[PDB]
Design an enzyme around this catalytic site. Structure first.
Site, mmCIF file in Angstrom:
data_model
loop_
_atom_site.group_PDB
_atom_site.id
_atom_site.type_symbol
_atom_site.label_atom_id
_atom_site.label_comp_id
_atom_site.label_asym_id
_atom_site.label_seq_id
_atom_site.Cartn_x
_atom_site.Cartn_y
_atom_site.Cartn_z
ATOM 1 N N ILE A 1 0.349 -9.344 5.804
ATOM 2 C CA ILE A 1 1.407 -10.054 6.490
ATOM 3 C C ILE A 1 2.703 -9.988 5.689
ATOM 4 O O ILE A 1 2.732 -9.459 4.585
ATOM 5 C CB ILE A 1 0.988 -11.517 6.751
ATOM 6 C CG1 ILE A 1 0.825 -12.272 5.426
ATOM 7 C CG2 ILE A 1 -0.293 -11.561 7.577
ATOM 8 C CD1 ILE A 1 0.559 -13.756 5.577
ATOM 9 N N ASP B 1 5.897 6.570 6.496
ATOM 10 C CA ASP B 1 5.916 5.724 7.666
ATOM 11 C C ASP B 1 7.361 5.382 8.009
ATOM 12 O O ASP B 1 7.784 4.232 7.877
ATOM 13 C CB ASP B 1 5.032 4.481 7.484
ATOM 14 C CG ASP B 1 4.697 3.803 8.809
ATOM 15 O OD1 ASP B 1 4.752 4.488 9.861
ATOM 16 O OD2 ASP B 1 4.382 2.589 8.810
ATOM 17 N N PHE C 1 7.161 0.846 2.233
ATOM 18 C CA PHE C 1 6.659 1.996 1.475
ATOM 19 C C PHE C 1 5.159 1.905 1.220
ATOM 20 O O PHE C 1 4.611 2.700 0.471
ATOM 21 C CB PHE C 1 7.359 2.099 0.130
ATOM 22 C CG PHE C 1 8.796 2.494 0.213
ATOM 23 C CD1 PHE C 1 9.764 1.577 0.566
ATOM 24 C CD2 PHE C 1 9.193 3.779 -0.133
ATOM 25 C CE1 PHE C 1 11.103 1.945 0.611
ATOM 26 C CE2 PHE C 1 10.527 4.165 -0.081
ATOM 27 C CZ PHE C 1 11.487 3.245 0.297
ATOM 28 N N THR D 1 -1.655 -3.844 7.231
ATOM 29 C CA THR D 1 -2.419 -4.035 5.974
ATOM 30 C C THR D 1 -2.401 -5.478 5.430
ATOM 31 O O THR D 1 -3.252 -5.879 4.614
ATOM 32 C CB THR D 1 -1.881 -3.120 4.868
ATOM 33 O OG1 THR D 1 -0.509 -3.450 4.639
ATOM 34 C CG2 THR D 1 -2.009 -1.635 5.263
ATOM 35 N N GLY E 1 5.864 -12.238 9.810
ATOM 36 C CA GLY E 1 5.445 -10.932 10.257
ATOM 37 C C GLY E 1 4.042 -10.492 9.937
ATOM 38 O O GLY E 1 3.233 -11.227 9.348
#
Ligand SMILES: CC(C)c1nn(C)cc1-c1nc2ncc(Br)cc2[nH]1
Length: 289
Positions: free
Chosen positions: A34, A140, A159, A32, A28
């Site tokens: 991976i 988020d 987080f 910011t 993924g």
């Protein structure tokens, strides 16, 4: 940096995970860094590793947040942090691995029925009472941030953009979060509390109901402009949701944050009574359909 690396050194566990971890795999990409998975050679258990570059950030002191706030935190409904380290110029956060994957994959491929949606919401809301209780703001929330187990259990992740508030620093001021899911006040640069999370949750329900958030096919910049300016968005297909679900959503999507419901309250709303066991989510997951 020179100084900032030195600080992060002192909050993270010392040492190098590479010492105990083998067989890394990128699975993924967030905004910011991976996400890898890896295997612990002793035992053979799987872990997720978030890897963020120190030099490649906008606002790094943010990077401070999860590691400081969310170390030693535990919940049925939160993805657990194990340790954190610096690896060269990267921050590595080693976490519990979730087989089920993300909710995104579900909301973009099937039609979650009411029972299932409530079960996601209860799980999220349980988590969120305790988080806000402690003055923690996730900042988020979205289907992306919701991770599942093989058997249907729901846990909240990502987080990286979370915040702390207190008696002395009561609200926050910075634009974080993700644009489609951000709250009005937050866009309008107001001081904001936890309650921003609650709005973002509502956008998640639209995700769950209509398969994507409001204003999605817009440019990110203009979406915010829209999110700021117009009335609370309502569903594309209203005729498809129970009155139970409506009233509930109408407690989440409230422009005036002082009237927007607290998770505390939401934990009681008749709707959530519909929630069904973890095993009722199971067939929605990719490897079943
Ligand atoms: C690609 C992501 C959504 C994923 N797919 N699958 C099958 C599992 C995951 C996933 N599971 C995860 N558990 C913890 C963290 Br931190 C990240 C995680 N990513």
């Amino acid at each position: 940096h020179e100084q900032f690396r030195a600080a992060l050194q002192l909050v993270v566990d010392p040492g190098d995970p590479r010492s105990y971890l083998d067989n890394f795999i990128k699975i993924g990409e967030g905004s910011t860094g991976i996400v890898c998975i890896a295997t612990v050679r002793s035992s053979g258990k799987l872990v997720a590793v978030k890897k963020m570059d120190l030099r490649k950030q906008q606002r790094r002191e943010l990077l401070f947040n999860e590691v400081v706030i969310m170390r030693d935190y535990q919940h049925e409904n939160v993805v657990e942090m194990y340790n954190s380290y610096l690896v060269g110029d990267e921050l590595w956060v080693v976490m519990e691995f979730l087989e089920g994957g993300a909710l995104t994959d579900i909301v973009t491929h099937t039609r979650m029925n009411e029972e299932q949606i409530a079960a996601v919401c209860l799980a999220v809301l349980q988590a969120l009472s305790v988080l806000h209780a402690q003055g923690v703001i996730h900042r988020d929330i979205k289907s992306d941030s919701i991770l599942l187990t093989h058997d249907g259990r729901v846990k909240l992740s990502d987080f990286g953009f979370c915040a702390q508030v207190s008696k002395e620093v009561p609200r926050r001021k910075s634009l974080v979060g993700t644009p489609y899911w951000m709250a009005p006040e937050l866009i309008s640069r107001l001081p904001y509390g936890p309650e921003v999370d609650i709005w973002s949750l509502g956008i998640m329900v639209i995700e769950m109901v209509d398969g994507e958030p409001p204003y999605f096919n817009e440019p990110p910049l203009k979406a915010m402009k829209m999110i700021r300016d117009n009335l609370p968005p309502r569903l594309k297909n209203l005729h498809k949701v129970s009155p139970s679900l409506k009233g509930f959503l109408d407690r989440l999507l409230v422009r005036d944050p002082a009237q927007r419901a607290t998770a505390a309250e939401l934990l009681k709303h008749p709707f959530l009574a519909k929630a069904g066991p973890p095993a009722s989510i199971v067939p929605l997951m990719r490897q079943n359909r």
